[PDB]
């Protein structure tokens, strides 16, 4: 029996790394409130109501979230689907017209604009007639083209923009990723998983956990938080161009609002097309803001400073600065709240210093009605105003940082907020996953023959 | 409680267990391999890619001596330079992931030898039944 005869085996558990498309699976509970309310309530399969992970044993798979392909497929799929949820809505070509604007009725102090009362001609249901109509636009949407002044919208120089139908909600619903046939999805479970390298306790799973898609720049919200302690993640920490993601342990709470009691008003641009304009401000003119608890925020910065001293030496001076500059929605804090896009100045959180040994922070917010997210060539959208005072409450899951330094050996390490690419917001929720391909045909020796 | 044995009858549970214990639960990876307007095209294309991969593997298994068998036996001997390890350590110690990355260079040679073996077996069977 010194001879060994080769035997094949079909259905052997052994995988090799590969990349493929993944189909999304939204939960069927969103189907109970039907009729296109959020996206992918029609363009998405319902889930298995019985998810079943299968904890493996004595197994080591190398994970690397930075060279992952699933985050890139998600960044493509959200853009393509977000464009697919604007084509039935009304294009706002005819509203791009010369505006005659004045100040809103207010005790103007001679130091702020921030609202404009713009009258303009507009077509009617019939093609022949026309109507004078007034609206209220923000100052970040009108530009003085060169008596009362004479303005135009800012998108008119490059591209007309579809407004969003108010039957379509902007709020996230959890998106699962069920793997197709032939492939599988692994999952790290090590609580001290750095981000790159071996995770010595993996678990295969047929469909991923609840991923709610938020859109935010300075500090990501409602993001699955780590369990044992606050963690930081990077690719090369001694590199400057790569962001330094941070995931919290305790969710610090933020409250945001808009005190102006609006009045939504319908204008018929064309037959079958209606335009929604900010009609009147009853109540009082009060600026939008956000509040976090000062004590918990000082404690949470104490935790992240305790964590950052490991990678940099125990005797360094970690200090936090505000953003260096750039466009609007990378310096300020961008998010959506009830279907209306805020931009909140965050210099009031990011100023401190840290040496080796009740109230609440207010921070102002500015609002745009038109938005250009993902920075395409000729697509913006006009987010319509919403009736009444709105507010929304959110847990802060983590924040995105950025180190800087040129030379001259100083002990300080100034950190500033980041943003930039939208993909970093997804790399804080697809870090523990990896897609694999089954190769079920393996071959091995044993003692047997086949009988002729 | 569910029980830890439900791990082994589960999908891919034997991936860390030894090679002598994955052969009992080897049919679950075989069974869960097949079944499981732009989005319709993506999902349709992925599903037909999966069934083309399964059909390619069944055709490559059928031109050997085992068209519908999970376990099989052949008629070609192991060159000793392939893995030079005895029987007890490659069926009680090693895992399949480690075994796949120890013979990864020699696999096309094995497939060619199996094709030659089945071809000569077919012509020998035809010569045996030709005389009757």
């Amino acid at each position: 029996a010194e001879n060994l005869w080769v035997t094949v085996y079909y259905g052997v558990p052994v995988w090799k790394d590969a990349e493929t498309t993944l189909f999304c699976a939204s939960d069927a509970k969103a189907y109970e409130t039907e009729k296109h309310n959020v996206w992918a309530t029609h363009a998405c399969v319902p889930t298995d109501p019985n998810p079943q992970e299968i904890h493996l044993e004595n197994v080591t798979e190398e994970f690397n979230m930075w060279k992952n392909n699933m985050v890139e497929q998600m960044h493509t799929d959200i853009i393509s689907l977000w464009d697919q949820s604007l084509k039935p809505c009304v294009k706002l070509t005819p509203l791009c017209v010369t505006l005659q604007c004045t100040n809103v009725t207010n005790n103007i102090t001679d130091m702020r604009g921030e609202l404009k009362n713009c009258s303009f001609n507009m077509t009617t249901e019939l093609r022949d007639k026309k109507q004078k109509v007034y609206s209220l636009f923000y100052r970040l949407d009108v530009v003085q083209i060169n008596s009362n002044k004479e303005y135009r919208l800012i998108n008119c120089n490059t591209s007309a923009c579809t407004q969003a139908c108010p039957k379509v909600s902007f709020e996230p619903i959890p998106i699962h990723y069920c793997a197709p046939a032939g492939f599988a999805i692994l999952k790290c479970k090590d609580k001290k998983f750095n981000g790159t390298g071996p995770c010595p306790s993996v678990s295969t799973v047929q469909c991923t956990h609840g991923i709610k898609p938020v859109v935010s720049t300075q500090l990501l919200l409602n993001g699955s938080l780590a369990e044992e302690e606050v963690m930081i993640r990077s690719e090369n920490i001694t590199n400057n161009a790569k962001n330094i993601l941070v995931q919290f342990n305790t969710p610090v709470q933020i409250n945001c609002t808009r005190p102006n009691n609006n009045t939504r008003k319908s204008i018929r641009i064309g037959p079958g097309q209606a335009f929604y304009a900010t009609g009147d401000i009853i109540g009082d003119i009060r600026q939008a803001h956000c509040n976090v608890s000062k004590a918990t925020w000082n404690e949470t910065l104490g935790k992240v400073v305790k964590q950052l001293r490991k990678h940099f030496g125990n005797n360094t001076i970690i200090r936090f600065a505000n953003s260096s500059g750039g466009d609007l929605e990378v310096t300020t804090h961008s998010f959506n709240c009830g279907g209306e896009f805020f931009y909140c100045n965050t210099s009031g959180l990011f100023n401190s210093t840290w040496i080796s040994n009740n109230d609440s922070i207010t921070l102002p917010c500015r609002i745009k009605q038109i938005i250009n997210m993902w920075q395409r060539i000729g697509q913006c959208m006009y987010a319509p105003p919403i009736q009444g005072v709105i507010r929304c409450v959110s847990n802060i899951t983590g924040l995105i940082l950025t180190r800087d330094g040129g030379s001259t050996n100083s002990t300080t390490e100034t950190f500033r907020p980041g943003g930039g690419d939208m993909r970093d917001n997804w790399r804080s929720e697809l870090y523990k996953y990896k897609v694999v391909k089954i190769e079920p045909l393996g071959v091995a020796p044993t003692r047997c023959k086949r009988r002729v | 409680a569910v029980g830890i044995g439900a791990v082994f009858l589960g999908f891919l549970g034997a991936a860390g267990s030894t090679m002598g214990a994955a052969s009992m639960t080897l049919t679950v990876q075989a069974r869960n391999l097949l079944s499981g307007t732009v989005w319709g095209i993506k999902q349709l294309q992925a599903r037909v890619l999966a069934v083309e991969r399964y059909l390619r593997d069944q055709q490559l298994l059928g031109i050997w001596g085992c068209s519908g068998k999970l376990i099989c036996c052949t008629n070609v001997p192991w060159n000793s330079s392939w893995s030079n390890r005895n029987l007890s350590e490659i069926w009680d110690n090693m895992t399949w992931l480690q075994w796949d990355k120890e013979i990864s260079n020699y696999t096309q040679i094995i497939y060619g030898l199996l094709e030659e073996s089945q071809n000569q077996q077919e012509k020998n069977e035809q010569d045996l039944l030709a005389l009757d």
Epitope: P49 | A1, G3, I4, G5, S17
Partner: antibody, heavy 113, light 113 residues
Framework: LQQSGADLVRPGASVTLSCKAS????????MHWMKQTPVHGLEWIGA????????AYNQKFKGKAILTADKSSNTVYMQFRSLTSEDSAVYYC???????????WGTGTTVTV | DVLMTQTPLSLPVSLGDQASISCKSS???????????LEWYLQKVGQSPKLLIY???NRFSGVPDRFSGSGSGTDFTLKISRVEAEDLGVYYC?????????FGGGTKLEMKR
């Protein structure tokens, strides 16, 4: 339901503690192990399927805890390695059914380090 | 890991009142069966721990009907109808789906005077 007794263990010593199964067959039932700590309460350790011969553990206790079983005599052996003074707890044999509950339970073999 | 907590931690309840303790699950506990595999444990002091009920609804044989349990996948609780002296002990919540199997903290029902 048959067990070992309590021990007096030095730090850094490898001790094998058994509870042997009597009456019920090894092909049907599957054991587990436990810890009764006065701070963390109860914790899970591991398991044995004696037919297949290898299962997993709790990820804190891999390496230290190794579980072997002799199916002929039906004697189920733990093995610990490099014990600490923290392992003063009560260790419980337990029995499971497939998709099933805990049938029997051991009294306990305290390891006073 | 799917560790749980127990709210509250100790209830001295008189002989003949209703006691109710909850365990909250981080991840959902759903198997391919559909039934949420959670067990309720009681342990009288110096003994082996028993089983109070099964999943949410079924009951361990050899246990009286002074125990009831409720839950809807995410957060679970009990209701004890009448209190005895044997109902002294330490209670636990146990999971049965994912590895490693987690426990609750442990509650000690006491007397009132």
């Amino acid at each position: 339901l048959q067990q070992s007794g309590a021990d007096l263990v030095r730090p850094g010593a490898s001790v094998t503690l058994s509870c042997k199964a009597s009456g019920y067959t090894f092909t049907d039932y599957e054991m587990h192990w436990m810890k009764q700590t006065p701070v963390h309460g109860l914790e899970w350790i591991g398991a044995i399927v004696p037919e297949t011969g290898y299962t997993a553990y709790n990820q804190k206790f891999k390496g230290k805890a190794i579980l072997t079983a002799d199916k002929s005599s039906n004697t189920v052996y733990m093995q610990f390695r490099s014990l600490t003074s923290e392992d003063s707890a009560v260790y419980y044999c337990s029995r499971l059914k497939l998709l099933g509950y805990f049938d029997v339970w051991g009294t306990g073999t305290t390891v006073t380090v | 890991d799917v560790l749980m907590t127990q709210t509250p931690l100790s209830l001295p309840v008189s002989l003949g009142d209703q006691a109710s303790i909850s365990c909250k699950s981080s991840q959902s506990i759903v198997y391919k069966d559909g039934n949420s595999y959670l067990e309720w444990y009681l342990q009288k002091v110096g003994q082996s721990p028993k089983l109070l009920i099964y999943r949410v609804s079924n009951r361990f044989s050899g246990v009286p009907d002074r125990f009831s349990g409720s839950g809807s996948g995410t957060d679970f609780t009990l209701k004890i109808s009448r209190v005895e002296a044997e109902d002294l002990g330490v209670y636990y919540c146990f999971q049965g789906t994912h590895l490693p199997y987690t426990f609750g903290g442990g509650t000690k029902l006491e007397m009132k005077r």
